[model samples]
Target chain A: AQSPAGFAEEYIIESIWNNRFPPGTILPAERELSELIGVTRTTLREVLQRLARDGWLTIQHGKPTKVNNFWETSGLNILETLARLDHESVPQLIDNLLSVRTNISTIFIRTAFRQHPDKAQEVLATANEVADHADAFAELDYNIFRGLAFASGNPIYGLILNGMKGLYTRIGRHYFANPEARSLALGFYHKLSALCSEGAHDQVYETVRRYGHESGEIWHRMQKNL
Target chain B: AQSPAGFAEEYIIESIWNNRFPPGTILPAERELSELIGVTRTTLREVLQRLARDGWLTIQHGKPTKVNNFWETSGLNILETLARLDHESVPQLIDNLLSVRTNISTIFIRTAFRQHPDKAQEVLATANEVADHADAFAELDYNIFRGLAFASGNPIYGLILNGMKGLYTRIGRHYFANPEARSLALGFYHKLSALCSEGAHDQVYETVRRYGHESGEIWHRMQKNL
Candidate 1:
């Protein structure tokens, strides 16, 4: 994961994102790809296999290496790569990821209310004041959400959020920079728990949906203000 | 990925999983780990970085690398490694994964009914008879679920399912091996869509619950018999 291979991975990732090596496109042979990406054979092969493992591409014996449709084939691993790489799509990637996080959370909250209302209340009960600083607030927010994910009775939700810990905290700090966004987020702490305590499935879903919409609005304005 | 590093990754992964270097434990110095894992410094560094990237451990300059609680820190990538490794935890890992799939899907179906019942119906429309083979039936079953996930309006569900593509196909082929399980599976497909088309959120949740219960029942029996 050093320069030679790391550089090669960035190049291939950007290429795939830019559709230069679109899905189903068979990549060049090893020797050719090594030179094409300006890495030695050893490094290029390593990068290629890493990509394959992350679901960005497919490798097979006696068959051409194919680029996979990352959306359909990839997991959180691909997000980590895209997050680190310098690419035009990085911002868009962040937006999509946060959107998915909200979407999943809205649905996730429903489960919490229906199955583990007490746990949901317990998680919320622990919630205290978030720091005025963005980084501290973001970290607290993520932990709360991570807690909710675990209490939701589906372990994968917890894993998915855990997988994105670095990226989440990083973006979250900036997303909460605006005091309004932070206050909006902090308010959700009480609102969500109250909604869970009420145990109305439709009400829970709608409230979460509204929270997601408001969160997205903050992020959208932040980006535009940038 | 080919040699020194590939083997090193395996050794380190196995070591961590076996609690040779448990969570909260700092790893050995680079020089020692390199020697212990029987890899060169260059290869060891790459492998360590790769593990860190996958959330297996945390690496820092001038600080000891810390092993992570994969359950709390890792993603589906670690699951792939665990799935391939011969470990007692593998069975539990598979059970947890399938359980999450069912849990998430039960919630996911509610979205299908609320947002895009037509897409749900269309996905099921193409669901023909599965061939009398585990692999064949499993693939179809996964596709149906994947389709339902995509139509769920939360992209994360789809990504979560896709993230487990490798492990799913592996265990699923056997999960459906019992013709009884396969028949039970086909029933869920039609049953789920029927409930979706009805578009009652509560009914959808309840029906998917039944599907999840039946599915878990099959898996439990299979594992018990194993």
Candidate 2:
């Protein structure tokens, strides 16, 4: 279901994120780069323009395309591209991913009481539905966390959670494979459900913090085992 | 510097983000959709393919193209597209933007003291050089916050910050225009500089927290004034 243009995009984006071509450096000629990417010149130009629009390249008249400092210039497109562009395996985004999830989840919890009480009730209801069914637990877990984001009245958090749904689901599925981890996560889920029902904002923050750390530790173990 | 294909993308993306075309709905026929987009079928297809790759559309061989729930299916690209895709104005991402910034900055601060003392020293020196020049101060302010992210040894923070650079700069530029706000920021910068020099870990968290709230409040003030 993927596009062939993605092959070109992956080639160039991999090169860019990998720092194969440093910032301020003009790329190899169009024909050469196109050949390097194994795509037609037209297709290559299309991909290059996409990168340029995302701030990874600077295309100009009568000169070679230059690579911009992507760190200072690129958009969320680059992040998404880097995360999902590589088809063979997940990118090495483990620690960074955990950090982002942890921080944002913390924001959702920290802001939980300031917004919708009904949504908080909904979160508790969802949390109460967490079952011994492994995939079921994962699904409820994801819903509660994402629900917290939406409950916080910040569409951005919801959008962010939505954006990472696939990655999060993948990680959740992997993490729930361990019976012991599931038990521990079950405990945290119950604890969080109580906090949600009681509208205990600070306790919810603390509980979510523990959940994030435990999930991260389980991921660390998974990565190590891998 | 921009692609015409992007015009098609901007139009579709604006529509999706605006919820004009909800998820799971079939887009109009190519001829009608192309006309709606004011692009040739070829160009519209190109844009649609790009969106599909970014988790916006589901392209099928025989069926009509379906719009994916971009919030749940898309990546940061769609977020970036929604934020900056409009040519004339910024997206209304105010409170959510503040929440994201606040949480990530906290992570940066919390991890700041665990590594890179020299980088921490560099942070202080940069802070000490904070002048009354408004835009210049904003730049250093951003650098210091991002410096904490790097000092935390997480590239994700840098990437997230970089992704928001344009929007942040625009907002920061506006927020720092008030002399009193700049003076308050100056004082905080000095405090942070001293804390950095002392390798103050918890202090850095609290310090960054205060700074984030202050900057956020200034933004609130600006919005209110507007």
Candidate 3:
């Protein structure tokens, strides 16, 4: 059984996403909500506070808690939660996420290759050895991207990447599941590795940019098939 | 008079950050910690759970909670907390944040101009009228950047921007306080606007890229003088 607070948190978020408790709608009273979710008042309060911290609900003193328009108000926390929750909008959300990821990874990859070409080559060298399985490819791809972030000499890049770990794991598994997708990734890695060897930072940047856009389109088409 | 859980949360984070309770150190017993923080066990538990969710601690069943190496484990939540806390490393932290922000905004600006040149010009049109005060310029600058993100046609860009809202506000005020910084921003906006009007998408990209790096350096120098 899930923790009482954990269960309640998901239930409420799902409800909000479904518009059962739409933005600006005040939540039921504490006692009513606790009973509705089958948790104690104390447990419900804890869940509410956590939701508030994540920009889901706003708890007002002497007033009922109100739902927020999370898209405009929330942060990475909300994005992570939404990525894991079952929803019809997940495909579009994933597409948007990939767009941002592509942009970010392109910049970081350029920086990494420019600053430490050796590190870039070292990271890409392992690409050829990735096992022919979705899980293996997914893990290696994550590691390669993370390695580039670190090699960029900016801790914030790593931190931002860490923030999206759950989303990446979920989407990466699905993305790498297709044999074609796996091949595409391998080809990109080999090309990047060759560029790194030549110390062609500008070419590396252009290659990443073109591949990132194409991969995003590929992912979108794959989702449409599903 | 902060909420009991909120108070405990900050206190514990500060402790972990200061190495008073280093990473891998098991937290004291629940009862003991509640007393130490002057909060009830229920309140302490709520805070602990939230911290675990934010990657600051790992709570094992029937075992003491262990602090995680937040630099390696934590997400944007921890970064937001650290930005608001008083610490000696804040200057360096701000510098890193500025670097990441520069990379992100540069990409978003390029995309915005490429996809919606009219929106790009419309957003930059306000640059000439920004008030001389630091707060006004800071708010206007934020709006302009956020507008660009939205114009890029990727909701994720705006979401990521929202995630860094707090950090941006804290550092933006200080960065904009310098008259030189304000002048530099205005000049960049005008140049970007001219490029947008001319439909020079590639020039807009290069201009943003150059200005982003220089502005980050300027901000770093300003922090050092602080």
Q: How would you encode candidate 2's per-residue C-alpha lDDT over A39-90 as one tens digit per residue?
A: 8887777677667756788887688889888766664445555556554445
lDDT of 2: 0.70
Q: Give TM-scores for every candidate, taking all chains together and pairing residue i with residue i.
A: 0.81, 0.82, 0.87
lDDT of each: 0.77, 0.70, 0.79
The fraction of reference interface contacts (C-alpha pairs within 8 A across chains A and B) present in each candidate is 0.49, 0.55, 0.66
Local lDDT at B144 for model 3: 84
Clashing pairs in 2: none
TM-score of chain A of each: 0.81, 0.74, 0.84
Arranged by TM-score, best first? 3, 2, 1
Clashes of each: 0, 0, 0
Residue B99, model 2, lDDT: 61
Highest lDDT model number = 3
DockQ of candidates 1 onward, in order? 0.37, 0.51, 0.63
Best of the two (1, 3) by DockQ? 3
RMSD of 2: 4.1
User: Where in model 1 is the C-alpha error above 4 Å?
Assistant: A1-4, A60-64, A80-103, A106-129, A151-154, A191-210, A217-226, B1-7, B29-31, B40-46, B59-66, B82-95, B110-119, B195-201
Tens digit per residue, CA lDDT, model 1, A1-226: 3567778988898888878888878887888778788888767766776677677888876689999888788876666666666466667767767766776677567777788888888777765754688888888888878888888777667888886676777788899888998888878888888778776777776777688789888888888766
